[PDB]
Amino acid sequence: GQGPELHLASQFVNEACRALVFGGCVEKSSVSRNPEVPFESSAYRISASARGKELRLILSPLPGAQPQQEPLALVFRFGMSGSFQLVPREELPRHAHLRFYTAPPGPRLALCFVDIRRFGRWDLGGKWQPGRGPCVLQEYQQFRENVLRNLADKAFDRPICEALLDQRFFNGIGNYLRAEILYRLKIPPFEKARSVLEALQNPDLLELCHSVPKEVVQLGGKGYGEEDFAAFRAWLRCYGMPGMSSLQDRHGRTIWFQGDPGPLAP
DNA sequence: CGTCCAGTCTAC
DNA sequence: TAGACCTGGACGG
Numbered sequence: 001g002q003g004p005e006l007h008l009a010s011q012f013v014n015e016a017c018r019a020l021v022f023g024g025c026v027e028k029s030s031v032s033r034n035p036e037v038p039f040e041s042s043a044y045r046i047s048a049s050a051r052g053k054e055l056r057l058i059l060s061p062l063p064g065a066q067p068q069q070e071p072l073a074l075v076f077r078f079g080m081s082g083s084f085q086l087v088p089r090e091e092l093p094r095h096a097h098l099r100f101y102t103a104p105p106g107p108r109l110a111l112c113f114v115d116i117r118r119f120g121r122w123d124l125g126g127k128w129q130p131g132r133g134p135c136v137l138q139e140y141q142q143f144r145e146n147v148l149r150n151l152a153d154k155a156f157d158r159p160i161c162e163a164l165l166d167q168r169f170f171n172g173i174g175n176y177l178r179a180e181i182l183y184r185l186k187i188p189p190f191e192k193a194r195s196v197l198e199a200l201q202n203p204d205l206l207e208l209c210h211s212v213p214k215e216v217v218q219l220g221g222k223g224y225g226e227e228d229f230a231a232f233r234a235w236l237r238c239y240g241m242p243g244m245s246s247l248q249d250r251h252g253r254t255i256w257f258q259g260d261p262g263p264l265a266p
Numbered sequence: 267c268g269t270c271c272a273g274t275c276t277a278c
Numbered sequence: 279t280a281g282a283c284c285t286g287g288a289c290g291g
Binding site: 053077078079080081117119120121165167174175251253254 | 272
């Protein structure tokens with residue numbers, strides 16, 4: 001996922017788990033190379049928050065829960081095929097790699113981290129990844145200042161389309177978003193990042209890094225039924241669209257654009 | 267059947 | 279900077 005998908009997953013976990021109580025341990029698939037989650041409680045509530053491309057679950061035991069346990073935090077990155085689903089306990093999806101089980105009374109459900117390709121990860125810490133910059137969705141002002149204050153950094157030597165994926169500065173921006181952001185301003189994708197950003201300090205490029213992803217969030221849906229995908233496909237103006245050019249950036253990722261490739265094109 | 271296509275993370 | 283990590287769907291022979 002990118003920022004909007006991670007944000008919508010966090011809203012999903014919060015709304016779906018709102019009136020649920022989990023009990024038991026946290027079960028991992030045998031094939032997952034991520035860590036076993038050392039957690040058990042007779043009664044715990046799960047809630048979520050998103051920051052850029054990361055999602056933090058908090059497991060919160062109720063008063064009196066046994067074994068005595070402090071709340072535990074987990075941070076997930078989704079990679080290419082991560083998601084959360086709420087399913088019936090005995091109809092787990094095929095790649096449900098981490099599950100939380102509701103306690104009785106009611107229908108035994110499973111909250112599942114589902115990741116087909118297993119590019120996603122989780123850590124026990126609870127900390128956000130050091131080096132990821134502020135969330136373009138929820139920390140706009142911190143995100144904007146973190147870029148403008150560091151334009152000397154070598155990251156800004158690269159083409160703008162490459163700098164937009166560097167999660168140190170654009171935490172939450174991925175491939176469709178970089179295309180859609182640059183198309184709104186008709187910025188050539190191989191314009192130099194420092195050139196485009198130096199021309200700041202008018203919705204501008206950094207503002208669009210917040211407002212474009214926010215548009216996706218306001219669509220709703222995107223896994224969180226299938227008509228939700230036509231909603232998103234209709235919103236797109238550039239990424240994958242007939243009549244648009246594509247190039248490979250230097251890390252082999254496809255950038256979609258209109259017109260001028262830009263000076264630093266391969 | 268085969269190939270090609272869809273974000274880190276780590277070794278050189 | 280180049281390959282490593284994975285599965286599945288579209289599509290071509």
